[PDB]
Amino acid sequence: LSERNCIEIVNKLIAQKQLEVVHTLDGKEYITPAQISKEMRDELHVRGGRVNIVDLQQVINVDLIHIENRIGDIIKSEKHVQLVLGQLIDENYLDRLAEEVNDKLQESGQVTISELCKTYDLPGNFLTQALTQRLGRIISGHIDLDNRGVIFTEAFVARHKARIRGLFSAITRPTAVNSLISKYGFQEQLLYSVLEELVNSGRLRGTVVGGAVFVPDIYSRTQSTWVDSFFRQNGYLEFDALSRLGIPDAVSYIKKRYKTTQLLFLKAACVGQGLVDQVEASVEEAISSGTWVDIAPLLPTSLSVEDAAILLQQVMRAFSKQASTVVFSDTVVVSEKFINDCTELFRELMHQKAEKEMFMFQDEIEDFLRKHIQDAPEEFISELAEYLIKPLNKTYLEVVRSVFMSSTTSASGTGRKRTIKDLQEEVSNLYNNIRLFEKGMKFFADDTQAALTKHLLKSVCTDITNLIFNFLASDLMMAVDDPAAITSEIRKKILSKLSEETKVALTKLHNSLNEKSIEDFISCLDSAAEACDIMVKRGDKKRERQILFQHRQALAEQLKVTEDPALILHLTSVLLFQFSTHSMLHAPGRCVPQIIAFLNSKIPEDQHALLVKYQGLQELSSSIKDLVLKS
């Protein structure tokens, strides 16, 4: 038979399914799926216990799919075979691997799973599991399985312990442990086990803080001795010298170490007892001796002003019911007795000067303090002067008032007791007087009225308001013994120091002078009079009658006695008006002719003619007066 036809027979059989075969890549041979597995097993055994499916293709000379099927078959058919990255690995190969690893382990002391995988091409997890399953059984060692899966022998723990012992016998400062583990190539758990053994055995002296930094006993001892000696000798700590010694949390270190002792914390410092007692004793002495004390020279020079202030505030908390002492410059304590004594010291000179003038600038006060107080800081002088400005001023005001009284207990004493009895009377005379001149202003003509009203407001209204202004200024004493000695400027000055309630009333009374009507003046005048307790009594019909009679009598006597010609005529005309009209009148020297011209409507023609002829400019004037007595 031939070749091609035999091939044809075989394909016919394959079609009938009477025989399952596969074709060699070459094509010159036929392989049953049952013998592919035989060849694969034989090669897996031959070339050790490891094959690659690629090389299985190279050797069996069949396509890859068939080898891929038979590998899945062969794993099950022989449980001691696995498949890792397309490679059939046997247990014998892994056991030889373990023997080689044991040799190298007892050679170099340690192995790394990474290195083993690199030099054997297998994956890491597979190697870890394979070696672990037979660790101890064949491998003499122990597994980390955590930090690169390094295995080690009993002679590697020895080297680890030796190296840790050497390294930690050279540490004299607090150093991080993670840095050491990273840099020098240690194992964390083994490191801590050996370290605990050594520390317990006394070969190493230290503790780990944070469960990480190693603090050897020498460092802690030196730190503690330094700070303890400083506290003993000086009696305080600074929180900044402590920072330079390796203590960033001072407020915690001190409490942790010095808890039985009594301490006071002040920002950047901690003053122990003994300093506080001295400050307290000195402040006691200042309290009792009626003097002051500065606590700055009683404290270490390395304490800020804030710390001194806090300490002083703490010490002063023990004196609440004691004298109300005050603190200047945050450091100097001054007793109240001393403040009063200084006030008194100023008082004598203040009274002398007040009597002389019957306060000074702060600079003069500081000059006084310097003259009588010695060895003090400048800030103390400034603060004391500022404090004394007000109370000293009140003392000076009281002294001025007392001197005024003592110089006036008879002068203003009589003013208050006796004089008021005459002020009321004389204001009464003037007030009742202005009424009939209100009559006069009402009666006459409008331009004539303007003249009369102007002259009345000039002469008499001022006459009454000066009285009230004198009475008021009697308080401030700058009055003038002559009530005629009151002027507009003096009125403003008096108002310059008058109570608002009465000031408003007096302002109405004064500015009413600037007015052009007298009724508003009367209103404001009564308002002012009651605003200062001046009982104004409107005289009744009887008082009014007596006023009219007195004016007639005074005018008659004046112009039958006085020798001034123009004044004689003026009095004569006014009297004629009064008699013929029954109302008083007060006119200037710049309106006389108008009244005579008016009065021609009341009197004969001859007396009128004589008056007019006299005004138009001896024997003839002698007739004028004779008219009055013959009226």
Binding site: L1, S2, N5, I9, K12, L13, K28, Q35
Partner: protein, 185 residues
């Protein structure tokens, strides 16, 4: 004057019409005469075509006579025998292919020459019948490239299948030797 212009225009129109009428009459008469002359030319063409037809009948009869006398010189010929196509019945065809099947089975080795003879058809006809039977697959066998057909029974096919399924690896040459061994000639 105006009546004169009207009458003159009427005369001018009469002239406008008479000439056109005469022109149309001439164009009709002469064209009709020309068409009649063309028809006479067509009649002469008909005479020529009839001369062609008669001479063509003469030529056709001449061909007929030439053929009539052109057979006498024939008619000296000899039959050698006579035959008739008898039978290829599907029953007869079935019997023929059955006898072929038994003959080949008894022989089992044929080079298509003795087979072509005993079967008695040209070699191509044989190979057609053999290839059809194999395609439908009444009997399975091998047709050698050098020229032959060898019959293989299903049992021997199973024997070769067992040989493959047992020996594991076999080369084409190894299978050829095993076929020389198992397959019976």
């Amino acid at each position: 004057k105006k009546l004169r212009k009207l009458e003159e225009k009427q005369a001018r129109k009469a002239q406008r019409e008479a000439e056109e009428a005469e022109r149309e009459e001439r164009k009709r008469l002469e064209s009709q005469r020309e068409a009649e002359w063309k028809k006479e030319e067509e009649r002469l063409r008909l005479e020529e075509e009839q001369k062609e037809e008669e001479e063509r009948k003469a030529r056709e009869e001449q061909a007929q006579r030439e053929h009539e006398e052109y057979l006498k010189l024939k008619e000296a010929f000899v039959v050698e025998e006579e035959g008739v196509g008898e039978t290829m019945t599907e029953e007869q065809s079935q019997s023929f292919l059955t006898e072929f099947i038994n003959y080949i089975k008894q022989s089992k080795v044929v080079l298509l020459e003795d087979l072509a003879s005993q079967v008695g058809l040209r070699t191509q006809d044989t190979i057609n019948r053999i290839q059809d039977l194999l395609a439908e697959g009444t009997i399975t066998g091998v047709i050698d490239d050098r020229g032959k057909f060898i019959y293989i029974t299903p049992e021997e096919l199973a024997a070769v299948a067992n040989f493959i399924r047992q020996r594991g690896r076999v080369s084409i040459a190894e299978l050829a030797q095993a076929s020389n061994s198992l397959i019976a000639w």
